[PDB]
Coordinates of C-alpha atoms and ligand atoms in Angstrom, one line a residue:
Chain H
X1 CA 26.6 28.5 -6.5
X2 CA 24.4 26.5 -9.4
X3 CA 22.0 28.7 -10.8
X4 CA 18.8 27.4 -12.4
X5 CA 17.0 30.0 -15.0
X6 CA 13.0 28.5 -14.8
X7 CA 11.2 30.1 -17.2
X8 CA 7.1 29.4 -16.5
X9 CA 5.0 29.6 -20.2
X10 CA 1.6 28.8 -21.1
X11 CA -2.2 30.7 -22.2
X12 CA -3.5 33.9 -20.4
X13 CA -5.1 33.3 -17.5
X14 CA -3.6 30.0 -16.2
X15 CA -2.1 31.2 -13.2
X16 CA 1.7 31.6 -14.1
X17 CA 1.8 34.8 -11.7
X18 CA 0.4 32.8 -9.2
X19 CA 2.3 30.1 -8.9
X20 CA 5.7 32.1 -9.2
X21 CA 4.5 34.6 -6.3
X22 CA 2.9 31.7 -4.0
X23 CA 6.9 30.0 -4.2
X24 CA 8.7 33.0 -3.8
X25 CA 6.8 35.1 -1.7
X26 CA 4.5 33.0 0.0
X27 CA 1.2 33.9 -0.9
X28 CA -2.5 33.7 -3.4
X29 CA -2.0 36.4 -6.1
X30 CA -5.9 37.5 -6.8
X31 CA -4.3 40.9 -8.0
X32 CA -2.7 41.6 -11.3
X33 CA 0.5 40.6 -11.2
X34 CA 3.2 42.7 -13.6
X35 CA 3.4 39.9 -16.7
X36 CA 6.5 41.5 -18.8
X37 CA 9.8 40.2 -18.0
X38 CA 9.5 40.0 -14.9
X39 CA 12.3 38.4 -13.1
X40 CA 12.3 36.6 -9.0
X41 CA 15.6 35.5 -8.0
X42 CA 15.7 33.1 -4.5
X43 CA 18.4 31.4 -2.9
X44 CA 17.2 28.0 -2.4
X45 CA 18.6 25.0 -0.9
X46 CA 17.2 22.2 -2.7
X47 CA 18.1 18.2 -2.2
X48 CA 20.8 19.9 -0.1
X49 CA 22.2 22.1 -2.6
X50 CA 22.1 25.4 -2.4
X51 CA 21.7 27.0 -5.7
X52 CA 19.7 30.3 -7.0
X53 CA 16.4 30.3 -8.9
X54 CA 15.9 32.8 -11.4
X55 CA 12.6 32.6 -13.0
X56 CA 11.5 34.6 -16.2
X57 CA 7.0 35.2 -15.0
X58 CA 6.0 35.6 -18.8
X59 CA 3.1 37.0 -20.5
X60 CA 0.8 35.0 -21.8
X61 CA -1.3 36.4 -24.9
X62 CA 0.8 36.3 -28.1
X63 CA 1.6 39.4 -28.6
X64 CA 5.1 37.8 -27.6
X65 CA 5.9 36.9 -31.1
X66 CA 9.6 36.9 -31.1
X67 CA 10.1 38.4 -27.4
X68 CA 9.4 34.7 -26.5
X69 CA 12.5 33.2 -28.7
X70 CA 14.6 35.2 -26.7
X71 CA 13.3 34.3 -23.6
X72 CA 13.0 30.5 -24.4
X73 CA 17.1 30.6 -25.7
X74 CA 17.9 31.6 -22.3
X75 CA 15.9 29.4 -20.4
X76 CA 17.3 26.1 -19.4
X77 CA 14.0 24.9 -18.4
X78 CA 10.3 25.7 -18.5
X79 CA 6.9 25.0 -16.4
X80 CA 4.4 24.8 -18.7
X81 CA 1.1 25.9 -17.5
X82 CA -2.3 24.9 -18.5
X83 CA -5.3 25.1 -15.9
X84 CA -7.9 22.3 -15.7
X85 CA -11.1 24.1 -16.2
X86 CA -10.0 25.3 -19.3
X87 CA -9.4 23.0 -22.0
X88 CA -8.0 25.8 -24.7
X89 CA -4.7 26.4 -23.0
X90 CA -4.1 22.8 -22.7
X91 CA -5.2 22.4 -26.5
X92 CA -2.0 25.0 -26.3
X93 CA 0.8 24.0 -24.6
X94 CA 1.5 22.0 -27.9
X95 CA 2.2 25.4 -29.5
X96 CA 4.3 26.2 -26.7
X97 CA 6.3 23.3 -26.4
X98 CA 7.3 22.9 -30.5
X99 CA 8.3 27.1 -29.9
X100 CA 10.7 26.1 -27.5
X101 CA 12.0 23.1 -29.3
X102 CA 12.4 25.0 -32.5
X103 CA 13.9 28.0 -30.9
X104 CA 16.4 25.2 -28.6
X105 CA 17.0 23.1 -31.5
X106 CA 16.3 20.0 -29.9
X107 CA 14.0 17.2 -28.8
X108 CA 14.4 17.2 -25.3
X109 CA 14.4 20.4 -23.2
X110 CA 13.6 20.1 -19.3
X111 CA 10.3 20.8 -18.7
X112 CA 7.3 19.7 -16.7
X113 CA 3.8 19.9 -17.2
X114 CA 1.8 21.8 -14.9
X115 CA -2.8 21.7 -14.6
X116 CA -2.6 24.6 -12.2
X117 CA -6.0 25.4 -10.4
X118 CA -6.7 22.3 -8.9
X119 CA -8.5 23.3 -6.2
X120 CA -12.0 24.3 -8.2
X121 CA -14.9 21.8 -8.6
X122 CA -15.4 22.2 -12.2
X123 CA -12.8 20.8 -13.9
X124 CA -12.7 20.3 -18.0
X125 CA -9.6 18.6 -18.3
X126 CA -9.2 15.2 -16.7
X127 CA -6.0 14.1 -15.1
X128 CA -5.6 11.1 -17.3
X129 CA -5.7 13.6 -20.8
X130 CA -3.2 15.5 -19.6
X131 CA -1.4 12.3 -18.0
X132 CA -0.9 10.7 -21.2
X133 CA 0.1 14.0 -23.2
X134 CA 2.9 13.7 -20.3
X135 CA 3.9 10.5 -21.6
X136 CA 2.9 11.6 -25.2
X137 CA 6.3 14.2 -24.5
X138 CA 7.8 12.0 -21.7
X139 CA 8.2 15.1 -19.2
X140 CA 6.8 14.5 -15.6
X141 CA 3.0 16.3 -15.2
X142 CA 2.3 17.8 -12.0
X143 CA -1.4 19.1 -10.6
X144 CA -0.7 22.9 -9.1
X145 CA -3.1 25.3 -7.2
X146 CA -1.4 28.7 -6.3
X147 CA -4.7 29.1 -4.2
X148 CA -3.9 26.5 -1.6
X149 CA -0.3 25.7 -2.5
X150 CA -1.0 21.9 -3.5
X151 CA 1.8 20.8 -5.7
X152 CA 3.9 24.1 -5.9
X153 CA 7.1 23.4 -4.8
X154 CA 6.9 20.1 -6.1
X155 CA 6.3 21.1 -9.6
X156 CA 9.4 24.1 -9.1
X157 CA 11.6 21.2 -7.5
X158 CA 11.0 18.6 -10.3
X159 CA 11.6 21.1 -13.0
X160 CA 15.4 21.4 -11.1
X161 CA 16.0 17.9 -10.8
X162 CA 15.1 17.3 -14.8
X163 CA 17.7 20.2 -15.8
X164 CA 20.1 18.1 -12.9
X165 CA 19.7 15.1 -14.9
X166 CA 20.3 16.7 -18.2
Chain M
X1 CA -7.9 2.0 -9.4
X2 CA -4.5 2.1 -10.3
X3 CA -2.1 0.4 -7.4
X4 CA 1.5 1.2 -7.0
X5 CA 3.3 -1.5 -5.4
X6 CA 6.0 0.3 -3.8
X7 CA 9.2 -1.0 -2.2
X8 CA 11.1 0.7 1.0
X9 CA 15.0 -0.7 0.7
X10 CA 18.1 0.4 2.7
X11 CA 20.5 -0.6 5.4
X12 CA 19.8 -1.1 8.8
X13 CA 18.7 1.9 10.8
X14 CA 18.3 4.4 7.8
X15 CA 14.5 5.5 8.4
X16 CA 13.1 3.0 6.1
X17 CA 10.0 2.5 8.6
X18 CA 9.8 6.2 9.9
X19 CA 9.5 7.8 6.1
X20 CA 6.4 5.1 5.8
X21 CA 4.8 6.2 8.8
X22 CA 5.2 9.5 8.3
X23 CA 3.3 9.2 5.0
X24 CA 0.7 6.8 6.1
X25 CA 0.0 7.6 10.0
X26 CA 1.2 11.3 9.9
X27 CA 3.9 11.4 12.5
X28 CA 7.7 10.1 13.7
X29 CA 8.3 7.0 15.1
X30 CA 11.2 7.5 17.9
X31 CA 10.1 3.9 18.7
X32 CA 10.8 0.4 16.8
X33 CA 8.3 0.0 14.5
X34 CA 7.9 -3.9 13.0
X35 CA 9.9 -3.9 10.2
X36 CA 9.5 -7.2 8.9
X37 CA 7.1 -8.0 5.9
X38 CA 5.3 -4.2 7.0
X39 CA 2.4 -3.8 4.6
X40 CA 0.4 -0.5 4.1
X41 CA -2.3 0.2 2.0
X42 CA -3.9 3.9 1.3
X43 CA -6.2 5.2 -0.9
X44 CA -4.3 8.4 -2.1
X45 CA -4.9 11.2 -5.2
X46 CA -1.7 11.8 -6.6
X47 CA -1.8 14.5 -9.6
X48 CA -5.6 13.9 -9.6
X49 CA -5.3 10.4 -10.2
X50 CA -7.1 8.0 -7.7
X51 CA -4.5 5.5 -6.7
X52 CA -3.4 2.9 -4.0
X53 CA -0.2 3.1 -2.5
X54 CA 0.6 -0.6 -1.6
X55 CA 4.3 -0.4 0.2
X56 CA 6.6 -3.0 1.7
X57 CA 8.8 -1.4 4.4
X58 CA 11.7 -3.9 4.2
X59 CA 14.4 -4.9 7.1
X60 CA 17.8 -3.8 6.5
X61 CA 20.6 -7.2 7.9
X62 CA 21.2 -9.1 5.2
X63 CA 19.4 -12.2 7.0
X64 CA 16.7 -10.9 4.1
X65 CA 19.3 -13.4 1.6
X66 CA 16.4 -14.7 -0.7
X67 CA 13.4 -13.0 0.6
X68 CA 14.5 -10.0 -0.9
X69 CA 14.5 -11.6 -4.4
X70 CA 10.4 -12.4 -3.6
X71 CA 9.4 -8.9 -3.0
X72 CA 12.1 -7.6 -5.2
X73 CA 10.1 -9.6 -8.0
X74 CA 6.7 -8.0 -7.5
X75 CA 8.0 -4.6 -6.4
X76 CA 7.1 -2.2 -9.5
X77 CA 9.4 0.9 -7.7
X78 CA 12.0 1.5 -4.9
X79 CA 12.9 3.6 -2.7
X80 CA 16.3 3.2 -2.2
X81 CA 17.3 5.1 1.6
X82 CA 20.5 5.7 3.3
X83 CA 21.2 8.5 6.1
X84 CA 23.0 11.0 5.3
X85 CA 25.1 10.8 8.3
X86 CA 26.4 7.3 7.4
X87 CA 29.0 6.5 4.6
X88 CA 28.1 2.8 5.1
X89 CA 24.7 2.9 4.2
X90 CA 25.3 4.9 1.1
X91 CA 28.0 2.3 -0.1
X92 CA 25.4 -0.3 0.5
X93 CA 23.1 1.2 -1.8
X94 CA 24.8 -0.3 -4.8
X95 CA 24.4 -3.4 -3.3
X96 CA 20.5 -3.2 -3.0
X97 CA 20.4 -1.8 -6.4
X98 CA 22.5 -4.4 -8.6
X99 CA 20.0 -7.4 -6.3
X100 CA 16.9 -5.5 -8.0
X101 CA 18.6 -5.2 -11.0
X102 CA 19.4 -9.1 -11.2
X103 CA 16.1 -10.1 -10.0
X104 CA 14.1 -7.6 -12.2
X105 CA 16.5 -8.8 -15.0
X106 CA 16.4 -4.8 -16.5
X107 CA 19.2 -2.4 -16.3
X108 CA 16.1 0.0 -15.6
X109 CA 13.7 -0.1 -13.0
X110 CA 11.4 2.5 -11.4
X111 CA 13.6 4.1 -8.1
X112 CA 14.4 6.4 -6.5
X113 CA 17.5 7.7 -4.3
X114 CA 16.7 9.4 -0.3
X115 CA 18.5 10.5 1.4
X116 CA 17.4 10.5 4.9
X117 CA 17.6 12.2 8.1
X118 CA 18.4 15.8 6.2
X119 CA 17.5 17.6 9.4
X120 CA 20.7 16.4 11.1
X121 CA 23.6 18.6 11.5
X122 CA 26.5 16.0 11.2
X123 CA 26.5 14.6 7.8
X124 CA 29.0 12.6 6.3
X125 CA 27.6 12.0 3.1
X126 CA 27.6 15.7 1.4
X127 CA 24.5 16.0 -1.9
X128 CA 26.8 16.5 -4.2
X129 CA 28.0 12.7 -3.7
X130 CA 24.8 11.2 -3.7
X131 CA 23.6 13.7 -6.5
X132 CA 26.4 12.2 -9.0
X133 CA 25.7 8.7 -7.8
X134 CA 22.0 9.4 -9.0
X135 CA 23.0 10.6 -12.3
X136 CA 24.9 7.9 -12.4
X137 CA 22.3 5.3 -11.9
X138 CA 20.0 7.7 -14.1
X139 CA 17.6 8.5 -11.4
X140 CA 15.7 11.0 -8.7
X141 CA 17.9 11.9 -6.0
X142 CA 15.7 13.2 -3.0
X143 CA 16.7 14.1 0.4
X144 CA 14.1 13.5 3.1
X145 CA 13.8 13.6 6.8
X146 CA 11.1 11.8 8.1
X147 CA 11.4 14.0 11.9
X148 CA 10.3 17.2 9.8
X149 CA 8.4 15.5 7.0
X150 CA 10.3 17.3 4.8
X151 CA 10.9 15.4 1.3
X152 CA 8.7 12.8 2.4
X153 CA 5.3 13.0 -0.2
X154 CA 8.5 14.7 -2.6
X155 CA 9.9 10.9 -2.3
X156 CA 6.9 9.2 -2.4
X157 CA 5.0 10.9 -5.3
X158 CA 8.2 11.4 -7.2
X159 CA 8.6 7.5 -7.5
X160 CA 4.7 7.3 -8.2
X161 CA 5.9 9.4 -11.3
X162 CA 9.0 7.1 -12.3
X163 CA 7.0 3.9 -12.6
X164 CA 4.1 6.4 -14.5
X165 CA 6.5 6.9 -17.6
X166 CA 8.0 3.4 -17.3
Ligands
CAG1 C1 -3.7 39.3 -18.7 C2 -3.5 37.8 -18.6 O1 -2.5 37.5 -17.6 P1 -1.5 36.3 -17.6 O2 -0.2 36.7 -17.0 O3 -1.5 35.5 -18.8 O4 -2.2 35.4 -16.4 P2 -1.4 34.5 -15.5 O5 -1.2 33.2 -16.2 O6 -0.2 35.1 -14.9 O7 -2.5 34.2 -14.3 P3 -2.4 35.0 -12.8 O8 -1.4 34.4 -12.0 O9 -2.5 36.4 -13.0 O10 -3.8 34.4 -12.2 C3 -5.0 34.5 -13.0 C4 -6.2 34.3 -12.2 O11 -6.5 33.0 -11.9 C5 -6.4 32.9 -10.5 N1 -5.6 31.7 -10.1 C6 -4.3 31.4 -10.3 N2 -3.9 30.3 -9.7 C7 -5.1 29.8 -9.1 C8 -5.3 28.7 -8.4 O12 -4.6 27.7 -8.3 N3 -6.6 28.6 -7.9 C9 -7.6 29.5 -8.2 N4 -8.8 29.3 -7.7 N5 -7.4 30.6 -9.0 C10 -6.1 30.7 -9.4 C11 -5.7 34.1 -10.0 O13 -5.9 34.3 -8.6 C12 -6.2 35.2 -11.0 O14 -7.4 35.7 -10.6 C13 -4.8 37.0 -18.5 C14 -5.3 36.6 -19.6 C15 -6.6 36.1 -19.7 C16 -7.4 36.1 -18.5 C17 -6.8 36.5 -17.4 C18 -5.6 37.0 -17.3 N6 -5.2 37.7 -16.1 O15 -3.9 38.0 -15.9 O16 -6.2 37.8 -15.2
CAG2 C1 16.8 -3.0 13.5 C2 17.1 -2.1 12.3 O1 15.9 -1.6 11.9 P1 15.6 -1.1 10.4 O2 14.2 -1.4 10.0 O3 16.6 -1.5 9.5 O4 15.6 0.5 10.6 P2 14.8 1.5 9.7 O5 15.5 1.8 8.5 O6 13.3 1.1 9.6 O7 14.8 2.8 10.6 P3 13.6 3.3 11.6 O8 12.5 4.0 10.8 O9 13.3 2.3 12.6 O10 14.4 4.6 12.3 C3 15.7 4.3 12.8 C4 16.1 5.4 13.8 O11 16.5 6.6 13.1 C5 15.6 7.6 13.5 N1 15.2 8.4 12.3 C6 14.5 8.0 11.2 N2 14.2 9.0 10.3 C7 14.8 10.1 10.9 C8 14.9 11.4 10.5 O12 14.7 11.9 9.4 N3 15.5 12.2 11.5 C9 16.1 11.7 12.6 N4 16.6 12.7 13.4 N5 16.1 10.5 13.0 C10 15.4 9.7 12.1 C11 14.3 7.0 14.0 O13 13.5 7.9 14.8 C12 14.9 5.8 14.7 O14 15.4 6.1 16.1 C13 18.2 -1.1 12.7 C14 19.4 -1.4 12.4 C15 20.5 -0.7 12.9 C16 20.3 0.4 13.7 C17 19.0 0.7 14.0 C18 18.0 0.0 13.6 N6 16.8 0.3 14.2 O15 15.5 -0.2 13.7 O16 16.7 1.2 15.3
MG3 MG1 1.0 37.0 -15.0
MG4 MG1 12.0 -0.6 10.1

């Protein structure tokens, strides 16, 4: 069958874990999570293919100095998390996104962008800012809460189809 | 707000009116809905953006001849529906798509490609097809059913997304 290897990046804190365990095991991390390599692999049927989904959960903090350029060669496409009541790690995903396209050599990877947490009141990040960074890379951008499972598979399933259309 | 004026294209029978109301009235039409110049409007957050959906649900015969071109004029993106247990309807789809094509006077417009009525056992069009005809055309491919709702906000936001980066 097609295998897709998702790799899901971004800041501490973002909810990464939690989106990975709300799509592959159906429920609201408010534990710690294991964030080394770990690994989920899912049959899926998806548009009416079946395929497998093996997705690399990273770490966050950059203490990943390297470790991540072996991850990101792999990867044929990556969620990149921000959450929107924190405006640092969407100030970051820019140094996420030129890692992966200097470790992939190339302009275009499949990616989406993901403001994960949408659920809380207090957000810091509009829609439109991250909208227009979207744009700014020309991936699609996707609102996420792992809480209440808004936008999950959505965000997981678009990420598939850009790699499809690659 | 933002409005998305959205257009619901396909041959006859397809589920062109029951994807609609399963987005807009939240459940399956069994019965004949009007399906003539079939206007709904909705107030809807998509990726934290306040927006109105505006959508046409079109009829399929070709007596449509040149009242297609009109709201294939002002249409910004289409959905473009066959079922996926009819061969016919999916050959017809290059039809609808060269008519937008020619009226929008792009090689490019906003659209995307359902397949509908997924939760069917008999299919005659497998994904694969209708996957390499999307690619093809350089688009989405999304299969729906409107009995389950499965696909169906998929299809609908996905499309939102398409005429966001146009
Ligand atoms: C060690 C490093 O960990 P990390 O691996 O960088 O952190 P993750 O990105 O994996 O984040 P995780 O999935 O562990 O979720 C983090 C917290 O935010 C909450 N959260 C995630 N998704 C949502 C959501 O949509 N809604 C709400 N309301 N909360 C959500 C979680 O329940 C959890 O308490 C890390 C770094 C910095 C801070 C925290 C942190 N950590 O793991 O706790
Ligand atoms: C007049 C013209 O009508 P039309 O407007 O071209 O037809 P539509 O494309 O709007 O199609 P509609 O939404 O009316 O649904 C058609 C039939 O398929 C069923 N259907 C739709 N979606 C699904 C789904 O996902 N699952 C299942 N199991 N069935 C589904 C409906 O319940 C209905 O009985 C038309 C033309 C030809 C044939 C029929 C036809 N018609 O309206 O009945
Ligand atoms: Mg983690
Ligand atoms: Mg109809």
């Amino acid at each position: 069958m097609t295998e897709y290897k998702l790799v899901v990046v971004g800041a501490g804190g973002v909810g990464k874990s939690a989106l990975t365990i709300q799509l592959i095991q159906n429920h609201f991390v408010d534990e710690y999570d294991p964030t080394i390599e770990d690994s989920y692999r899912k049959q899926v049927v998806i548009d009416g293919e079946t395929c497998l989904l093996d997705i690399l959960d990273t770490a966050g903090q950059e203490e990943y100095s390297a470790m991540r350029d072996q991850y990101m060669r792999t990867g044929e496409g990556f969620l990149c998390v921000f959450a929107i009541n924190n405006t640092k790690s969407f100030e970051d995903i820019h140094q996420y996104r030129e890692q992966i396209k200097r470790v992939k050599d190339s302009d275009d990877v499949p990616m989406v962008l993901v403001g994960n947490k949408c659920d809380l009141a207090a957000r810091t990040v509009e829609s439109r800012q991250a909208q227009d960074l979207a744009r700014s890379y020309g991936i699609p951008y996707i609102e996420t809460s792992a809480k209440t499972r808004q936008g999950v598979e959505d965000a997981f399933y678009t990420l598939v189809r850009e790699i499809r259309q690659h």
